[model samples]
Each structure stands twice: as structure tokens, then as C-alpha cells.
Target: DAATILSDLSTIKTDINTLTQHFNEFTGDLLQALAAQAVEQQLESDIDQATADAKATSALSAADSTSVTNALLGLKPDIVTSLDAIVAKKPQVDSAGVGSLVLSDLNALQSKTDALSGALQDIATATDKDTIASGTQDIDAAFSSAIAVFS
Candidate 1:
């Protein structure tokens, strides 16, 4: 008779999926809101308005709302790079694998991903740009810590 192994590792894969779905949905909403604001502002200040006001027609102002929005969005690329590093080695084992090997790794990954997702959401809800930026930085640090565990 084989000895029975007890572990709830199988739940890790499910947790990762759940966290990814939630993060994607949350980020999608933030992007949509920003895009809508930009579009509406553009529509409000059109060619006629630009021609009527020399200041409005001048080269794109760096201090304008659109410029700020673009600057803020510039954070995305770096964030993606960091996130990719954290999830780069997600285990391929699954529930069907021998010794429930896959489940153990998957569960560990899931916990890390869940923490990453929570950090991201915290940054997303920040009230000010500086706070948001700081939150994101914290998230990046947390992700690094999580990845270190796997390494």
C-alpha cells in the first residue's frame, strides 16, 4: 500500500487564474476610463476652437490634461516588464501530474500572483498621482520578493 500524501496544493492553479482574471478586468476598466476622458476632451476642443485661439493652436502643451494623461500612462510598459519577470516561470504541472507535483508548484505560484494582483489594485485605487506611483513601486517590490521565493 502507498502512503497517502496530504496537501491542498491543487488549489493554487485555480487561484492564479482567479487573480489574473480579476487584475485584467480591473486594469481594463482603468484604461477605458482614461481613454474616454481623452477622447471627450479632444472632441470638445476641435479645429474651430483651435483656430479661434492662438494659444490653443500652439504646439502641444506639456502641462495640458492630455499631456499629463500620456505621461501617467507611460508607466504601463515598465509595469508590464516587471510583472512578466515575476510570472515568467509559472509551473506547468497540473492536478493530473504524478505525486501531485504540479499542484504544489501551482499553489505556490497562485499565492504569489494573488499578492501581486492585490498590490496592483491598491495602486489603482490611490487618490493622487504620486500615491498611485508609490503604490505601483511597492507592488513592483512585492513582486520581486515573491519571485525570489521561487528562485
Candidate 2:
């Protein structure tokens, strides 16, 4: 029974590790895409400011201003499309529910230990033959308590 309990705990540990790895990767990719978007926004702002400066200072002919405007507009569509693609790749955490379940299981396990502290003390101070038997019984009870919650 202890062997089965250990096996189950190992399986749960593996699943938790796998889920954590996936969540880390998901957040990393999401943040990278958002950073890219921020850079694109800065570039677009710079382009707009340059266009305004060229127009206000008469540094470019009206014809040149029109050409610059057209070029800026062309860049907008590409940036917008890239942003849309990044948004489409948003991460979904399918194992989110598992985390809550694990938390509840651990709370239950803690409760079992809390209830058995006196028995644990008895086990620690076991000296007489009857006290030693009682300690063994307490140990078995604790094991059963943990196994039930773990399963």
C-alpha cells in the first residue's frame, strides 16, 4: 500500500513539473511578443513626429510630404497585422484546475497531521511494551490518513 502511495505521489509530482514548465514557456513567449509590440508602437510614433516636423519646417516639398505620408500608411498595415498575429498566439493554461485541486489535497493532509500530534508525541516517548504498541498503531493510522488524502 505504501508502494502504491509512493507511486501515486511520483505521478502527481511529474504532472506538476510538466504543468509548471509549460506555464513558464507560455509566459516567456507572451512577454516577448508584448515587448515587440511596444517597440513597434515607438517606431510608429517616431515616424509620425518626423512627418510633422518635415511639414512644419517646410523641409520637404508638398510632393515629398505626400510620399512620406503614403509610406507611413503602408507601414501601419504591416505593424497592425503583426500585432494581430501575436495576440492570436495567446497562451491557455489547461492544467490551472489541477493546481487548485493539489492545494486542497495538501490542506487535507496538513489537517491529518494536526489531529495526530498527540499520537506522534506518544510515539516519540514510547518506552513500555504497551506504549510501544500504541505508537505502532498511531504510525499506521498516520500512514492511512496520508494515503487517503494522497489518493
Candidate 3:
């Protein structure tokens, strides 16, 4: 029945809320991590560690991939919210003197996020296994670079 279907979807959305928490916590953690290291030029190692973790995250199965794609697409605005958190912290980071290349890393990371956002759109609209899987992996790679930036 339609009632049962919609109810199931509600369940899914609630579960997606858990997933949402995951995303929120990531930024939370990153901010905390950033704060802890904001003094002096300490984040270089932290950035490498975060990059490795993002790179090492397991790929979702095609079935699971579709759901994540949908969830992240809906979460794009929140995505920018997390981004602003980073941007807000930038002035402090700049004072630490990470070196000149740090700015370029942030710029490259921004473009990578743009590509990741496009991949999210692609995944959301995809009809088959390949595109969805590719988008998932693309997001993963983009994120690896995203977290790794700021030198």
C-alpha cells in the first residue's frame, strides 16, 4: 500500500538523519582538530592524516551508493555550511604561516569540491551501476584532496 511505502520512506529519512549526524560530526571533529592545532604550523601532519582517512574510506556498494548520493545531494546546503566553518577558521590558519602554497591548496580544494558536487548531482540522476559507482569513487577522491588541503 502507498501508506506502507511512505512509512518506509520515513524510516529511511530518519536513518538518513543518522547519516546526517555523521556528516555533521565530521565537520565538528575537523573544527575541533583545527582548533587544537591552530597554534603555530601544526596542521600539516593533521591534514595528511585526514587525507589518508578520506582516501581510505571504503566505497559504498551500488545499492548503498544510490542512497548516499541522494542524501548528500539533499545535504549540499549543509555541505556549504561545513565549508563556511572552515572558511571562518582560515584567518587564524593564515597567521600560522603555513607557507605560500597553502592558498593554492585551498583553491584547488574548492574546485575539487565543486567537482564533487557535480558528481553528487550525477549520482543522484544516474540510472545504472557504473555512473553511480563512479560518482561515489569520484566523491571519495575529491574528498581526499579536500581534507588534505591547506598544506
Q: Which candidate should be chosen as best, given TM-score against the real structure?
A: 3
The estimated TM-scores of all candidates read 0.23, 0.30, 0.33
**What are the per-residue Cα lDDT tens digits for candidate 3 across 29-136?**
435444433321232332233233334435445655566455434434443444344445555445554324335544554454444334334433345345535544
Which regions of candidate 2 deviate over 4 angstroms?
A: 1-56, 92-151
Q: Stretches of candidate 3 above 4 Å error?
A: 1-68, 99-102, 114-151
**How does residue 19 of candidate 3 score in lDDT?**
33
Q: Report the Cα lDDT for residue 140, model 1.
A: 59
Rank by lDDT, descending?
A: 3, 2, 1
- With a 3 Å backbone cut-off (N, CA, C), the pairs that clash in candidate 2 are none
Candidate 2's residue-wise lDDT over 16-103, tens digit each?
A: 3333333334443445434433443443343333323333342333343334323323333333333233233332211222323333
User: Tens digit of lDDT per residue, candidate 1, span 1-151?
Assistant: 0000001111222333333443333322444334433432332233123223322222323233233223334434444543453244233111212213223333443344334333323333233334435544654565555445444
lDDT of 2: 0.35
Q: Score residue 65 of candidate 1 by CA lDDT.
A: 27
Q: Count the backbone clashes (under 3 Å) in each candidate.
A: 1, 0, 0
Cα deviation of 32, candidate 2, in Å: 2.9
Cα displacement (Å) at residue 20, model 2: 27
